Design a binder for this molecule. Structure first.
Ligand SMILES: Nc1ncnc2c1ncn2[C@@H]1O[C@H](COP(=O)(O)OP(=O)(O)OP(=O)(O)O)[C@@H](O)[C@H]1O
Ligand SMILES: Nc1ncnc2c1ncn2[C@@H]1O[C@H](COP(=O)(O)OP(=O)(O)OP(=O)(O)O)[C@@H](O)[C@H]1O
Ligand SMILES: [Mg+2]
Ligand SMILES: [Mg+2]
Lengths: 73, 73
């Protein structure tokens, strides 16, 4: 149940072998995340600062509770 | 005549003020670049390794001679 990383379509854009497991292609932890109840302005600021399009949302134990993408904005 | 950086539309996606100069938004040097006469396989490998979409091509003196994008592939 641990958030070990994130896999986006920039990671698997040119992977010819589509039977490859996720663990060989994903981006490993630590990731850029936000706390629960993060406002939209703070999430957008994080996305602009780190120049990523995704932002996982985790609780106090570091367990995944949500995800914010640039698609929302 | 020096390559001081690169500006892509991920850098200027949420810039409300379009009168801002490039110098305040660009990604400053050093960049991930390739030498002249780089093959397609080497450029694609660099793009996959650094997870970027653009690769400036410079000469021995470090001056810009070309540009490769993921659009080509
Ligand atoms: N929150 C995050 N923390 C760390 N790395 C991340 C995070 N979100 C994405 N990445 C990584 O950053 C890279 C690009 O992220 P992003 O999600 O912006 O790309 P993308 O949506 O796949 O891009 P494109 O739309 O151009 O194909 C990928 O390697 C991805 O794994
Ligand atoms: N060769 C490079 N060296 C260093 N940084 C780079 C290079 N090319 C691009 N970047 C930077 O990496 C970030 C994303 O690069 P990229 O060109 O993949 O994004 P983009 O094409 O704008 O993305 P999207 O398609 O998701 O809108 C930007 O901050 C950009 O300035
Ligand atoms: Mg994008
Ligand atoms: Mg893209």
């Amino acid at each position: 149940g641990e958030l070990v990383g994130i896999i986006t379509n920039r990671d698997m854009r040119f992977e010819v072998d589509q039977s490859k497991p996720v663990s060989e292609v994903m981006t490993k932890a630590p990731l850029i995340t936000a706390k629960e109840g993060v406002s939209a302005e703070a999430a957008l600021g994080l996305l602009r600062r780190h120049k990523i399009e995704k932002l996982p949302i985790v609780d106090g134990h570091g367990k995944l509770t949500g995800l914010i993408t640039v698609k929302d904005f």
